[PDB]
Structures are given as structure tokens and as C-alpha cells.
Amino acid sequence: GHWGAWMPSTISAFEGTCVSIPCRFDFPDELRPAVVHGVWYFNSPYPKNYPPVVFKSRTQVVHESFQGRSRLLGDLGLRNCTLLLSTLSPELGGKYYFRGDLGGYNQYTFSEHSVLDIVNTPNIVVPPEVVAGTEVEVSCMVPDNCPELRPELSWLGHEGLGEPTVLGRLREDEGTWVQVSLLHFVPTREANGHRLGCQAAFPNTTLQFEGYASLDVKYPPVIVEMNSSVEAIEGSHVSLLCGADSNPPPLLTWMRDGMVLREAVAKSLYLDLEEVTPGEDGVYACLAENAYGQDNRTVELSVMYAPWKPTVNGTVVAVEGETVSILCSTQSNPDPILTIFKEKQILATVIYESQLQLELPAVTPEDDGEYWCVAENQYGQRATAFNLSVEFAPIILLESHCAAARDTVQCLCVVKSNPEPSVAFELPSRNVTVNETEREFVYSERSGLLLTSILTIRGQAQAPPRVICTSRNLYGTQSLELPFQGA
């Protein structure tokens, strides 16, 4: 064929271990030299910039940095130029060329080369993404390019997780050989932050080389930091703490009835409320959402607040003998117990309810006065008041009399009615006496519901003059004869 060669671009091995560079070449078969010499140049392609001579046919003189370190296996004449370099060191790490010397002026340095790496750490391969709910395999590749010292592998930090599987050497890249060791297992949620290692050793040696890798397992957020059902006062400070444990940043959302609130991405979100109201009462949900799974957890916040200042509707001023409905409303957050009562007497008692109604069958006069409505509760109590002032058909009280002093005669009659009662006296006075004695006579006064009135007849002997009292308003009329107590 034509000129040309075959050599693996990349080759690697450990410290103190031999390498075996696979090499093959071609030259015009037209020439058949009986003696074929060859040279292994280091770090440089052109002879012009003098490179270290790794090996030369029929010549012991090489570079002093390769003296006793290298030797060629197999005749060149059979197109075989594989090379062995034992006991490596980091200086020897570089690029290697092969130049051929057959005949004269037919000396060719081949362009295609091989690069020598000198690594003392094995190569571990792990999947880009490790899900906590899928089966995962991790490999440990070690570059065995030495047939005399065959390396053996070890798994450090295995912690069970099933047996390690083993392979012989596989055909890595272009003709190079590598012993691989794979591990097959399925992670949990604790697999993250774990350390996995791979060791390599040889029988007759004190050489031991090791490599590491830390796992990044992706688990779905499961909410741990979640406080339960709470009860807080209005105005007080409310601190809800929501925490999710996911290795991928879990999208944490605070929501209620479909509201945005504070949406954020972290391991723990705070939700603060001040001036708590009955509107903020109820259920708050925290959703931990991740591309590997989701978890929602909910809490109940009961706002405990003293009952509102009560309000009362219904009738207030009705007639006598009628029906009266009084409706008392209150908006409390914890079940309020509320009672309504008159001065000295208690009327209606409702237990654990929002509002209370009281009905009155008929109105006796006494049902006038002011009543009270209290809303009692565990955390506080407020109240309100309402005057029931009914309408009356005038009632002349029997505290009424006619006292007779000797010289002059006087009477006292009292009534009670809601509107002011036009009051009057009637009397049987013998004959007709005008401008005699007195003509101005009586006087009257009122306090609240009571209308007191006093009569005074002047110059009347103890001869008992009968006296009658009458009272009218817009509703009723009453008349009554008064008795004697004096003399």
C-alpha cells in the first residue's frame, strides 16, 4: 500500500505501571529493505526542535530520562511496533511520535500520534440525573494497558446495596483495553450526600490507587416542618412555617381558596400575619411542588375574638296589650353565649349562638323601663342597651286621698300614663260660690311616667265635700271618687 500508520490517539496508565502502545505501520511495499530501523520521538514531531529519543533500533543510546525505562516488542519487519514503557513518572507524560528508517532518504516521521497520560486516579461514571424512584447504575473504569501487571478492583463505601458486578477488559476508544466494574442499586431519599469510592491494587506491589464520587439523588419533596391546627387572637402575630425536603429546589406556595399570597422557592417559607381578622380565619394550604413530585399539607387557623358590640332591631315603642319582637344580633368568632335582662328580672338566655330573639305576649305597664343585651364569651364580653317605653291608657293610683284640715280642705290624686294626661277635678259644691275664698285652687307636676296632682278648696267646713278625679290622653279616660282620712 501507501505510507501511513495506525496508532491509538489516547492511552493512559498509572504510576509505576508499564504501558503497551499498540502500533502498526505501512510503507510502499515496492521497497523491501532487509534491515528496518525505527525511532520513538517524545514531545516533538520535527527533528529540527530536538526531542528526547525514547527508542532506537540497534542503539542503546537514548535520552537519559528514558534510560532503562523502555523496550520494543516484536520485529519491525513484520510491521509491528508496539512499545512497552515500564515504571512511569509524570515527566514521561507527553505526546509520542513514531519515525521510520528504511533505506536512505526514505525516512518518515508519521503524522498520526499517541498521547501518554499519567493518572493516579480511576474514572467513575454516574448518570446525569438520579431519581429516588428509579434504578441506577454507576461504573468504575480503570485503564489496564499492562499485560504483566493485571490490576484488580475494589468498591469502598459500598454499604451493601447489592453485589458488585465485574467485567474483563473492554475495547475502549481505538484498540485500547480497560477493566470496568459496574454497580447496580436503587437509592432512597437519604442517598444524597453519600460518598462512593473505587480502589485498585496489584499482587506483588505496595501500589494502591483510589478515586471518589459523591451522589446527587433527586427526591420528591415530602413536607416535614409543618405545625398543626392553631387558634390565635385577632391583632396578634401569626407565624406559619412551611418546610420541604427535596434535593431539587422545591417550589413552595402559600395558598387559600385560590390566592397567590407569597410564592417562593426555598427549603422553608415563612408566612406572617398581623391584625388578624375574621376574614383571615379558616384553612391555609402549603404546596411543595417539584418536577420530580409534589406534596400538599394544610392547616386550620381559628381566630378567637371577643363578640362584636351587639345591635338590636325590631319594634321599640308599641301599645298596651300588643305583641313585641326584639331581635338582638352579634357576630362572634367563637360560639358566643348571650342573655337579655330587665333591671331586677332576667328574660331570655341563648346558649352558643349568633343571635337571640325575645317575644313579649302582652305588655303590662311594668314592661316599660330599660333593658340590657349582653354577649358573653370566653375571651371577652360586650353589651348594648334599649329602652322599652310603652303607651298607656291612664291609671289613677290608689295612693290618692282627701285630707281635711279644720280650717281648709285638701286633696291629692296621682295617675300614670305614657303621653301627658290632661287632668281635671269634678266636685259637688252646694249653691254657687265664685270669687269667695279661692278661685285659683289646684296644682300639678310630672316625673317620668307619673303625673301627680293636688287640689285645695279653701274655707270649707268639715262638712265633707265629695271629690272626683279624671284623666284623659289620646288613648283612655278614667274617673274616681277619693276618700277621707283626716278628722
Ligand X SMILES: *[C@@H]1O[C@H](CO)[C@@H](O)[C@H](O)[C@H]1NC(C)=O
Ligand Y SMILES: *[C@@H]1O[C@H](CO[C@@H]2O[C@@H](C)[C@@H](O)[C@@H](O)[C@@H]2O)[C@@H](O)[C@H](O)[C@H]1NC(C)=O
Ligand Z SMILES: *[C@@H]1O[C@H](CO)[C@@H](O[C@@H]2O[C@H](CO)[C@@H](O[C@@H]3O[C@H](CO[C@H]4O[C@H](CO)[C@@H](O)[C@H](O)[C@@H]4O)[C@@H](O)[C@H](O[C@H]4O[C@H](CO)[C@@H](O)[C@H](O)[C@@H]4O)[C@@H]3O)[C@H](O)[C@H]2NC(C)=O)[C@H](O)[C@H]1NC(C)=O
Ligand U SMILES: *[C@@H]1O[C@H](CO)[C@@H](O[C@@H]2O[C@H](CO)[C@@H](O)[C@H](O)[C@H]2NC(C)=O)[C@H](O)[C@H]1NC(C)=O
Task: Give the footprint of ligand X on this chain (CB under 6 A).
Answer: 203-204, 227-228, 230, 239, 241, 287, 294, 296
Residue 462 found at the interface with ligand Y (CB under 6 A): no
The most distant pair of C-alpha atoms in the chain lies apart, rounded to whole Å, by: 187
388-427 burial, b at 16+ Cβ within 10 Å, e below that, comes to bbbbbbbbbeeebbbebeeeebbbbbbbbbbeebebebee
- State how far the alpha carbon of 135 is from the alpha carbons of 130, 138, 185, 217, in Å: 9, 11, 6, 11
Question: Which of these segments, 35-43, 82-90, 232-240, 370-378, binds its own copies (CB under 8 A)?
Answer: 370-378
Minimal distance, residue 30 CB to ligand MAN, in Å:
9
Residue of 159, 163, 370, 436 interacting with ligand U (CB under 6 A)? 370
x-marked contacts with ligand Z along 4-43 as a string, rule CB under 6 A: --------------------x-------------------
* Residue 239 binding result from ligand U, ligand MAN, ligand X, none, given CB thresholds of 5 to 8 Å by partner type: ligand X
Is 387 annotated as belonging to a binding site?
Answer: no
Interacting residues with its own copies between 308 and 347 (CB under 8 A): 337, 339, 341, 343-346
Residue 82 interacts with ligand Z (CB under 6 A)?
yes
**What is the CB neighbour count within 10 angstroms for residue 11?**
23
Instruction: Name, in order, each residue with C-beta under 8 angstroms of 186's C-beta and a sequence gap of 6 or more.
Output: 134, 135, 136
Q: Between β-strands 337-342 and 345-350, what pairing exists: parallel, antiparallel or unpaired?
A: antiparallel
Which three cell numbers mark 88? 512511569
Would you say 288 and 295 are in contact if contact means Cβ atoms under 8 Å apart? yes
Q: Are 95 and 30 in contact (CB under 8 A)?
A: no
Q: Is 315 in the site for ligand Y (CB under 6 A)?
A: no
Give whole-number Cα distances, 174 to 90, 119, 171, in Å: 23, 19, 7
Find all residues with CB under 8 Å of 260, minimum gap 6, and list them: none
Q: Which three cell numbers stand for residue 364?
A: 303590662
> What values do phi and psi take at 70, rounded to 5?
-130, 155
Q: Is 3 in the site for ligand MAN (CB under 6 A)?
A: yes
2 binds ligand MAN (CB under 6 A): yes
- Residue 41 in marked binding region: no
Contact of residue 203 among ligand Z, ligand X, its own copies, none (CB under 5-8 Å per partner type): ligand X
DSSP 438-476: -SS--EEEEETTEEEEEEEE-S--SS---EEEEEE-SS-
Choose the binding region for ligand Y from 237-245, 309-317, 386-394, 419-427 (rule: CB under 6 A): 309-317
Q: Which member of 43, 123, 139, 329 binds ligand Y (CB under 6 A)?
A: 329
Residue 425: name its binding partner from its own copies, ligand MAN, ligand Y, none (Cβ under 5 to 8 Å by kind).
none
Grid cell in block for residue 339: 342573655
Shortest Å, Cβ 310 to ligand Y: 9
Beta pairing partners, 264: 252
Q: Is 447 in the site for its own copies (CB under 8 A)?
A: yes
Is 107 annotated for ligand binding?
yes
Amino acid (1-letter code) at residue 460: Q
With a CB cutoff of 8 Å and minimum separation 6, the contacts of 57 are 36, 37, 38, 39, 72, 76, 101
- Taking the least distance from each CB to ligand Z, the nearer of 148 and 272 is 148
Site for its own copies in 177-236 (CB under 8 A): none
The reply on whether position 387 binds ligand U by CB under 6 A is: yes
Q: Does 90 participate in binding ligand Z (rule CB under 6 A)?
A: no
Residues that bind its own copies (CB under 8 A): 337, 339, 341, 343-346, 349, 351, 370, 372, 374, 376-381, 383, 397, 399, 403, 405, 407-408, 410, 412, 414, 438-440, 443, 445, 447, 450, 452, 454, 456, 458
Residues annotated within a binding site: 46-48, 99, 105-109
Residues forming the annotated binding site for a ganglioside GT1b (d18:1(4E))?
46-48, 99, 105-109
